[PDB]
């Protein structure tokens, strides 16, 4: 004759989560559906758990609910309502129904009870219809847009506030970001006054520049940047640990011989023998040829052609050779500043007659490294490329889908920061233009050039390390990015495998899942588009197995969290003392040996205000928000399935073990490697 429904609603704790809109709820089940019933006694504050008792038609077994908000009245400041979950008990049913949400309620929100499902799993027809309608609507809200033909697809949004609220920064992240921008302007202005009439005449002058910033500690390379051992160390454990490969033969255009490097070898063998023993490594920045730097110079194979106080910046495409010495230290042993060898682009070594020439060579290798790292390793290959997958998750996976639930905490952030970044950070005029040689426009062309070579197999850490020849700790010791990254790769892969096995019982279940198929196909066709001049991007058009699904999800999750953390949060230590890693140089490279002086070097190195702006950029890009959730913290995820909860438990406990092992390893290091501690790795790419 009627049922009594006990309704409990948990509102999210985040700022503005609450609402004063009038809320109603309609309940549907096997027997029919109630009317919209008022939940209108008391307030919905952030963090609240509020209870209601409403009476209506007995729907029998409950199958879905619909919340409605009237959107507030004249005085409502922020009617949008963030709902974590609704729990209902019906007087006629011996069951507790739990409806996870974790999304913003704007006007209407449909929710289903119980565990995640694949689209073909058996559910009431009205559930399947609502699921199909959700996804129709996703496609109108979440649309592809592109910087150019040669960039990965991004979310269509003019500014951050045009984004769907589910993918905007939380108010806490927007405050953390806007406050960081204000603090940077204040610290720049105070440091500008303090240093205004400073005679800039030594490398140690640059130490002033980080002193009035809250960076979490003096840059850990400030005291040792000038030592070859610590210069070499950072190609393993600094901000850009992705380019060094094992050298099994010198490139024909980098004609280093035993006579150039023998004074550096110290295990009793010559250069050819050390190459065969796997102790010789190399970096090749050839991708930077053709790069257009601010003020006009265009990099050639030979460097630059024989050209008041204009802002003119330079870069380089060097090769550099390194050697693992008998103590296990990676030492820099040769640098050629540009690609085409000869007298005007010679090989520089730590044994230069003129010590300033070797220091200048190391600075040219750093400028190439900085521009490559910021634009390719960090901006393109974390943010801009994984942004396509975040967009495709919203377009193609229903909120009921288990892989939607898995990805939510990891995709969060990237749409918001990238929408902001296109306007304020690496877009035209942004803080990047003030701080990189390739700023001014050349930085977009350069990312385009890099994106043409991008392949999804690059995001597979064990395969990429093996491919680079850097995975054998007996030949290449002291490589903590590799050690910690591989431990976390395995932990994430194990977890994802266990989630997949709960919902997909065999390969057929993958092939039949039209949403996961649409998801990968959307990236394949519209996300990482193989356009004229592009290599294949390694994105499959479909999934055929559980293992293939695991491998793509692991790559993606590991990149959003760990890889971004390793190449982003390492920036204070890498760049905070400018001479450790200059990102702008002001004169072209030398065309003969014996020229460099401390003074010609200081005039090539960034100006005080260029260096200050680099520090400011790093400060902004590396600020953790006070609401950040770190790796494995799934406190705001929508899981209900008991087995999924247990898989999460095992994963968190694994992460906890990896954390203690990293801290134990660190206690014996001269310079602890902390960027891959789980407690410092955000779930996502949000800054
Ligand atoms: Ca609100
Ligand atoms: Ca109440
Ligand atoms: Ca738990
Ligand atoms: Cl009713
Ligand atoms: Cl679930
Ligand atoms: Fe970032």
Curated annotation (Swiss-Prot):
An annotated GO cellular component: cytoplasm
| Domain PLAT per the UniProt entry, residue ranges | 3-116
Q: Where is this region: Arachidonate 8-lipoxygenase?
A: 3-687
User: What does the activity regulation annotation say?
Assistant: Lipoxygenase activity is stimulated by calcium, sodium, lithium and potassium ions. Calcium binding promotes interaction with membranes and thus facilitates access to substrates.
Q: How does it sit in the membrane?
A: Peripheral membrane protein
Main localization category: cytoplasm
- Which domain of life, per UniProt? Eukaryota
Q: Outcome of residue 45 to A?
A: Reduces stimulation of LOX-activity by calcium and membrane binding. Abolishes stimulation of LOX-activity by calcium and membrane binding
Q: How does the cofactor attach, per the note?
A: Binds 2 calcium ions per subunit. Binds 1 Fe cation per subunit.
UniProt EC number: 4.2.1.-, 1.13.11.40
Which family, according to the similarity comment? In the C-terminal section; belongs to the lipoxygenase family.
- Describe the task this protein carries out: Bifunctional enzyme which is responsible for allene oxide biosynthesis via a two-step reaction; first the lipoxygenase reaction that converts polyunsaturated fatty acids such as arachidonate ((5Z,8Z,11Z,14Z)-eicosatetraenoate) into a (8R)-hydroperoxide intermediate ((8R)-hydroperoxy-(5Z,9E,11Z,14Z)-eicosatetraenoate) followed by the allene oxide synthase reaction that converts the hydroperoxide intermediate ((8R)-hydroperoxy-(5Z,9E,11Z,14Z)-eicosatetraenoate) into the allene oxide (8,9-epoxy-(5Z,9E,11Z,14Z)-eicosatetraenoate).
Q: What is this protein called?
A: Allene oxide synthase-lipoxygenase protein
């Amino acid at each position: 004759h009627h049922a009594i429904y006990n309704v409990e609603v948990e509102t999210g704790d985040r700022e503005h989560a609450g609402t004063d809109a009038t809320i109603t709820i309609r309940i549907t089940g096997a027997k029919g559906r109630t009317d919209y019933l008022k939940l209108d006694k008391g307030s919905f504050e952030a963090g609240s758990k509020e209870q209601y008792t409403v009476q209506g038609f007995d729907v029998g077994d409950i199958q879905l609910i619909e919340l409605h908000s009237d959107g507030g009245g004249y005085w409502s400041g922020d009617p949008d309502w963030f709902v974590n979950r609704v729990i209902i008990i019906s007087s006629t049913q011996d069951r507790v129904y739990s409806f996870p949400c974790f999304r913003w309620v704007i006007k209407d929100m449909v929710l289903f009870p119980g565990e995640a499902t694949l689209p073909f799993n058996e559910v009431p027809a009205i559930v399947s219809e609502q699921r199909q309608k959700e996804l129709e609507q996703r496609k109108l809200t979440y649309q592809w847009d592109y910087v150019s033909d040669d960039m990965p697809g991004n979310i269509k949004a003019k500014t951050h506030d045009d984004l769907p609220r589910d993918v905007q920064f939380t108010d806490e992240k927007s405050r953390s970001y806007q406050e960081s921008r204000k603090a940077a302007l204040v610290n720049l202005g105070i440091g500008s006054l303090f240093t205004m009439f400073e005679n800039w005449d030594s490398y140690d002058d640059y130490h002033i520049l980080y002193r009035n910033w809250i960076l979490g500690g003096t840059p850990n390379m400030a005291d040792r940047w000038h030592e070859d051992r610590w210069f070499g160390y950072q190609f393993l454990n600094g901000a850009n640990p992705v380019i060094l490969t094992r050298c099994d033969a010198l490139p024909s255009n980098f004609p280093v011989t035993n006579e150039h490097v023998n004074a550096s070898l110290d295990r009793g063998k010559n250069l050819d023998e050390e190459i065969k023993d796997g102790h010789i490594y190399i970096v090749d920045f050839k991708v930077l040829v053709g790069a257009k730097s601010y003020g006009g110079p265009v990099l050639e194979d030979i460097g630059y052609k024989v050209p008041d106080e204009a802002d003119i910046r330079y870069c380089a495409a060097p090769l550099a050779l390194f050697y693992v010495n008998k103590l296990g230290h990676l030492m820099p042993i040769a640098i050629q500043i540009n690609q085409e060898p000869g007298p005007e682009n010679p090989i520089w070594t730590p044994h230069e007659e003129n010590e300033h020439d070797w220091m200048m060579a190391k600075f040219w290798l750093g400028v190439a490294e900085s521009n490559f790292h910021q634009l390719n390793t960090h901006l393109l290959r974390t943010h801009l490329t994984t942004e396509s997958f975040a967009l495709s998750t919203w377009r193609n996976l229903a909120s009921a889908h288990p892989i939607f639930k898995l990805l939510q905490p990891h995709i969060y952030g990237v749409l918001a920061i990238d929408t902001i970044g296109r306007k304020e950070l690496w877009g035209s005029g942004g803080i990047v233009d003030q701080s990189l040689s390739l700023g001014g426009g050349g930085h977009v062309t350069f990312m385009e050039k890099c994106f043409k070579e991008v392949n999804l197999q690059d995001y597979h850490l064990p395969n990429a390390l093996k491919k680079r020849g850097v995975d054998d700790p007996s030949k290449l010791p002291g490589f903590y990015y590799r050690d910690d990254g591989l431990a976390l790769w395995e932990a994430i892969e194990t977890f994802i495998g266990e989630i997949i096995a709960i919902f997909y019982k065999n390969d057929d279940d993958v092939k039949r899942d039209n949403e996961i198929q649409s998801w990968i196909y959307d990236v394949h066709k519209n996300g990482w588009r193989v356009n004229p001049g592009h290599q294949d991007h390694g994105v499959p058009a479909s999934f055929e197995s559980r293992e293939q699904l695991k491998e793509v999800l692991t790559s993606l999750v590991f990149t959003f969290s760990c890889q971004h953390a390793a190449v982003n949060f390492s920036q204070k230590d890498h760049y905070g003392f400018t001479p450790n890693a200059p990102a702008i140089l002001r004169h072209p490279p030398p065309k003969k040996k014996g020229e460099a002086t401390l003074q010609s070097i200081l005039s090539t190195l960034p100006s005080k205000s260029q260096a200050a702006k680099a520090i400011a950029t790093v400060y902004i890009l590396t600020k953790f928000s006070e609401d950040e959730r770190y790796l494995g913290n799934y406190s705001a995820t929508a899981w209900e399935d008991k087995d999924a909860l247990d898989a999460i438990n095992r994963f968190q406990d694994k992460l906890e073990d990896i954390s203690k092992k990293i801290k134990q390893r660190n206690e014996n290091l001269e310079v602890p490697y902390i960027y891959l501690l789980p407690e410092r790795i955000p779930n996502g790419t949000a800054i």
